[PDB]
């Protein structure tokens, strides 16, 4: 029960972290690269918290940093004019894949918290991360001299 709920959440966080590793193999703005690399460390710690009982690693400071990046990068982009389709420059497309895998991990983390006592920080972290990856995708399309893919 818990192993499936717990082992699955750990695996999805791992998968997400690996997808971010693929994104990091692409050319990126120095600031974006710094944020993503730091996030990888956060995810490593997050996985450890999900695994070990009585052990916590994600704090308000982690959440605050994500909130800061969201405000920052968003204030560096023009307002959203229409629904966006995942895609664009390769970097942006990968960021969107990371976004969807992060949401997948969030679902597993939420499921885990429903069957076992878990702090709220982990789900709050990936909730913010999904939003940030969406924002970073837009930043990467921008940085590539291109634009977001719009829908009908």
């Amino acid at each position: 029960m818990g192993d499936d709920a717990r082992i699955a959440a750990i695996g999805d966080v791992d998968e997400l972290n690996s997808q971010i590793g693929v994104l990091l193999a692409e050319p990126l703005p120095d600031d974006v690269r710094a944020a993503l690399s730091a996030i990888q460390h956060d995810l490593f710690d997050l996985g450890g918290e999900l695994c070990i009982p009585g052990h916590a690693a994600i704090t308000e400071d982690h959440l605050l940093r994500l909130a800061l990046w969201l405000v920052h990068y968003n204030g560096q982009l023009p307002p959203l004019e229409e629904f966006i389709l995942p895609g664009g420059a390769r970097g942006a497309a990968l960021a969107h894949v990371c976004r969807t895998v992060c949401r997948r991990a969030e679902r597993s983390i939420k499921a885990l918290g429903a069957s076992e006592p878990l702090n709220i920080a982990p789900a709050a972290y990936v909730n913010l991360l999904s939003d940030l990856l969406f924002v970073l995708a837009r930043v990467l399309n921008r940085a590539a001299g291109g634009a977001d893919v719009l829908w009908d």
Partner: protein, 148 residues
């Protein structure tokens, strides 16, 4: 500067009890975290959320909401506070159905008082505060429920 949360929970004692639970704040919010100084006179509910920023530390943003009794449960409807300092509007709706099935929806809005680099620290911090309280609500509401 907004956060939303919605969820369902079953009251172990059935419908009448679920209606009573959602209609009395002191019951429904007994185990709710991140709402400091929570209090009520039966008519309104009030308290504060804490936004942590550097150097100032924990900055308290008050809220005050009207309790509205409805046919299937109750709501909180936010009152407007002054612009002299940042505040929060806390809204919520709750229904109790057959068998004690309860549905909740909560909405939070931070209202800032009216330099560019600094605004970034306050917006991010306030956003984190709103999400922390919103994300913990299901846990908090569940903590108020008694055993069958």
């Amino acid at each position: 500067l907004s956060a939303e949360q919605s969820f369902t929970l079953r009251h172990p004692h059935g419908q009448a009890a679920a209606l009573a639970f959602v209609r009395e704040p002191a019951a429904a919010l007994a185990g709710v975290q991140r709402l400091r100084g929570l209090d009520s006179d039966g008519e309104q509910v009030w308290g504060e959320l804490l936004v942590r920023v550097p150097l100032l530390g924990e900055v308290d943003l008050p809220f005050r909401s009207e309790i509205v009794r409805t046919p299937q449960g109750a709501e909180l409807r936010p009152l407007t506070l002054t612009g002299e300092r940042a505040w929060v509007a806390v809204s919520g709706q709750a229904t109790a159905a057959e068998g004690g099935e309860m549905a909740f929806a909560f909405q939070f809005q931070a209202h800032l008082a009216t330099g560019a680099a600094f605004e970034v620290m306050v917006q991010a911090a306030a956003g984190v505060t709103l999400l922390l309280v919103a994300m913990a609500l299901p846990q908090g509401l569940a903590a108020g429920l008694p055993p069958a």
